[PDB]
């Protein structure tokens, strides 16, 4: 199916505790493939020239981000006392044919959106007056054309290569293993919990229906969570009146399943 490559970058200042820590992690879908940290199978196949080029770009990125953090403190009239965070997230999305669906290149400062490259890969959206300064500088320096070139070229090219080299895991969707548990809360009510375990990728839809009606408001949904062995887990629960369990159906949709599942409590 469709695939994505993304790098998730975090630069964090720490006044009095050295220079800002910089970490860049690379993913193909929900699979981390690389980590570069200033505090430090299918990928090692690449060779030394690949490694040397990536580590050198990472070192350059660390210096650019350290200077951006200095600039940001000034743009927001902040003191040198506090810790601040600049985040960058970029990459490409491709369809089954490996063709570009869209590119991404965005930034956040202190957890707030700062500036982002638009879907057109030519123009910027600045969140505030400080980001309008960055937009003006980046328009003058033709930064979008450089980012576009990576997003349309390099990103798609390398993503295609990684999917070929890592085909046995990257191209394999592992279906959820599912079951429904029953937990009496009182003599009048019980919790029905619908489980999904060992699935990949993380994207999944878990729902409960009562008489074929979606129970969106009465369903407790936990966030999808990593198991630690590449797979993910999720559960959805509903509180049901004792004896009415059979009116409830859990519905599961996932890429690894040819047909969705409909599950009920099986006493």
């Amino acid at each position: 199916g469709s695939h994505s490559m993304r790098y998730f970058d975090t630069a964090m200042s720490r006044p009095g505790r050295g220079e800002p820590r910089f970490i860049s992690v690379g993913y193909v879908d929900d699979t981390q493939f690389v980590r570069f940290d200033s505090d430090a199978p299918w990928i090692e196949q690449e060779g030394p020239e690949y490694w040397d080029r990536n580590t050198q770009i990472f070192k350059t990125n660390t210096q650019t981000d350290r200077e951006s953090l200095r600039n940001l403190r000034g743009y927001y009239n902040q003191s040198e006392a506090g810790s601040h965070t600049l985040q960058s997230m970029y990459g490409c999305d491709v369809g089954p044919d490996g063709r570009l669906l869209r590119g991404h290149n965005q930034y956040a400062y202190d957890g707030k959106d700062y500036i982002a490259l638009n879907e057109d890969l030519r123009s910027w959206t600045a969140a505030d007056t400080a980001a309008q300064i960055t937009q003006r500088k980046w328009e003058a320096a033709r930064v979008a054309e450089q980012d576009r070139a990576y997003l349309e070229g390099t990103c798609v090219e390398w993503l295609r290569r990684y999917l070929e080299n890592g085909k046995d895991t990257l191209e394999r969707a592992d279906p959820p293993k599912t079951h429904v548990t029953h937990h009496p809360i009182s003599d009048h009510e019980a919790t029905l919990r619908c489980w999904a375990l060992g699935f990949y990728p993380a994207e999944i839809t878990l729902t409960w229906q009562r008489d074929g009606e979606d129970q969106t408001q009465d369903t407790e949904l936990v966030e999808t969570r990593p198991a630690g062995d590449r797979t993910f887990q999720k559960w959805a629960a509903v509180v049901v009146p004792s004896g009415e369990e059979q009116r409830y159906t859990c519905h599961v949709q996932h890429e690894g399943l040819p047909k969705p599942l409909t599950l009920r409590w099986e006493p």
Binding site: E67, S68, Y90
Partner: peptide, 9 residues
Amino acid sequence: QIKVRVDMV
């Protein structure tokens, strides 16, 4: 493949 960042904010 990592992308270079040469322009500061």
